[PDB]
């Protein structure tokens, strides 16, 4: 499959290059984290929303949180077509405040750690 | 033009020196025009993106029963692009007719008057 | 409405924490309603005496002749107050009709955007 | 081809490091091209706000009458704009054919050269 | 299209995919970063040959050297399938000598700079 | 008048304070008035020896298939003078071009803009 | 078993402490078991990445002629794959054989036996 | 040709900078081979006395019942010689199959693969 994502230091940086409208790809990724979380056994995990052309998946808000709360590990998100994505993200509403618009969609958080 | 006036005023009322962001408006306010003023907040953050905003209501024109929803809605939206938004300004019984709406779910940051968020921001700085 | 709504935009844009104040505005408007703010920026003035005030007209909306002439005398009031007054934001083209109106008295304090303001405020702070 | 490689040449002559700004140009030049370059100054300054500007005239080609005005008119607006300006280069019999235009308003800052202006920025830097 | 590339600090981060059958994409790709050169105007470049399941393109090799050179810029590759990349590199042969094996395809020559 | 026009626009692109030397200029250009660049460059050099120069093609106006032929020689010219010459901006089409036609020789110094170039001077200062 | 045996005495002659990596080898040798070789450079890069490594051919066993040709290319390729290869130990008529060869294109790093060849890298260590 | 090509491997795998010596070979070998190598290890030491010395058995290719018998008799030798002896690396099943024999002389010093041996010996040393 053409998706793929590397990790620096213990930090993963997984990338939304597109709304991905397959779910099953969304549970091939998820899988793939999974994979690389036993592997790797690295703590640091990024996600970047360049866009989302889809949103209101709450599956995917899930697949998010359950990111998050598996990986016991870091989880950042760098906002993609806010604009048209947090209207319905906001619709959807949310329960969670671990992770946030990426610093610097990489270097604010890299720094954070 | 009225309109056109009362869009000229939002985008000011986001921009501080500092990238600090706020927002003070009118309280008796359009529900579309509150969601325009939502699809500026997202812009504006693209332009700048910014940690730093704020919702200034200081004075709200009017307590409107959907105008909450739109801050209610509004402010879980800062928090969501992961940026901050405060609450500096605002009437008091403007607030009774909020609690009074029996409105549970506020826990977010606030302040008094530009003053305290300032201070406050400053720190933050 | 939209008056008070625009009435409503003026005081939020002179108040500032720390006394610092400014004032952006649109800049096609109302002659009246420019009188209108010079009536506001002298009650603002009595509410709390503040040497520091600014006249912000970032974007101006458009360069009107007798809009200068508002700011014309306007800058003159604040030092008539002996209030301070400086120009943070504006446009070039702005700039440039009213360089091309041979305007001459202009030598006033001015800065860049909001941020070189507050930055000579918190100087002169 | 001629007009736009002439337009080529003002924004490099705007542009420099740090943020410094200029503009060296031709002496005997169209009265309606400085305005293009008065336009491109405006245009310039917002594209990086710069509170550091010159203009530079070294050699200017040829002291025209009305190419005065542009820089009376030209070096009042943008030093006004609150963005300063300077003249570090330019021939002495043309100035002379200024001064014994009887002009008397000038004023402002100059330099020797891009050599004492870029001194002096580096001391406002 | 598909491809996309994220920069961090002033370092670039191409990455190799797979072996693209398109050198019409490697121009794509040399377009994308040339425009990204000129818009960012940061230094740092890198490239990740994850695989390159093609080799002998000795024209993609060119695409590498003029990526160093236009870009007068930082330049790091990532071997991926060398067993069978290098020895079709080495029948290709080299005449440059500045990129090599990111240090630790990004961690290495990050930290180098 | 325009040709004298564009050669009034070389000696500027080359001259800077403190010896600094370079040489911004427009890329859809004449091959003679190139060889003219070239013999300019020759006499700036003796008016003031300068181990400093560069060339700047920002925004190259188009890549003339002759022109790198200049530049090609040109550079190696400068360089080997004993007076360095570096490229401090240019267009990137403009460089695939350039590696397109599958340019080998090029191993010289260069720069991004005039900003990284001045800082390498001042570092070489 | 005498093919599994010398597939044996690689990965070893390849392996050291501290992550240093070399490779001695008999010097009259299959050419297809030096392409084996070649793989096994490259696996063993991966299984850890190493910019230390080195080509050891302390008493070729025969300086044969297509042999050269693989540490040609071989030794092109260690840098190929962005690591380090150096020659710490070799005959000299093997040498002497090589130069006869009018071999030119070498100019890369060698040590004397495994002795100074650790000292480097105790020292690129 | 290819017992020639054994005896190549065993000098190398002695030698070693800093005068520390070593000895990884394959394990499913020849006994009458393995007493070579012991010819090996004697005039190795004379050539260049060494008191550090290792058996490197990583990977040993079989565990054969009598190839323990040299390893027992060679690591008695080599220690008591004066010149220390070492096992750096080997396989587990094949120290099983070992200690199934039921041996229980073995008391000697040894390492986790050439790592641990350099450590101890840059100790040793």
Request: charged share 20%; hydrophobic share 50%; aromatic share 2%.
């Amino acid at each position: 499959s053409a998706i793929s994502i590397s990790k620096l230091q213990d930090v993963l940086i997984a990338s939304v290059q597109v709304d991905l409208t397959e779910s099953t790809l969304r549970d091939f990724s998820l899988d793939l984290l999974d994979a690389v979380k036993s592997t790797r056994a690295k703590g640091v995990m990024i996600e970047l929303s360049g866009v989302k052309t889809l949103d209101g998946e709450s599956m995917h808000s899930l697949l998010d949180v359950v990111k998050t709360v598996e990986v016991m590990g870091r989880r950042c998100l760098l906002v993609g077509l806010r604009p048209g994505v947090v209207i319905g993200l906001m619709d959807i509403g949310i329960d969670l405040a671990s992770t946030l618009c990426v610093a610097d969609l990489e270097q604010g958080f890299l720094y954070l750690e | 033009e009225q309109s056109e006036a009362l869009l000229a005023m939002s985008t000011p009322v986001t921009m501080i020196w500092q990238d600090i962001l706020m927002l003070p408006i009118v309280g008796i306010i359009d529900s579309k025009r509150a969601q325009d003023i939502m699809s500026a907040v997202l812009n504006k953050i693209s332009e700048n993106r910014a940690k730093i905003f704020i919702m200034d209501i200081s004075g709200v024109a009017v307590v409107d029963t959907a105008v909450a929803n739109h801050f209610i809605k509004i402010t879980k939206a800062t928090k969501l692009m992961g940026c901050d938004c405060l609450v500096s300004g605002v009437s008091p019984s403007i607030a009774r007719t909020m609690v009074q709406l029996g409105i549970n779910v506020g826990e977010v940051r606030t302040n008094a008057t530009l003053r305290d968020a300032l201070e406050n921001a400053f720190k933050i700085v």
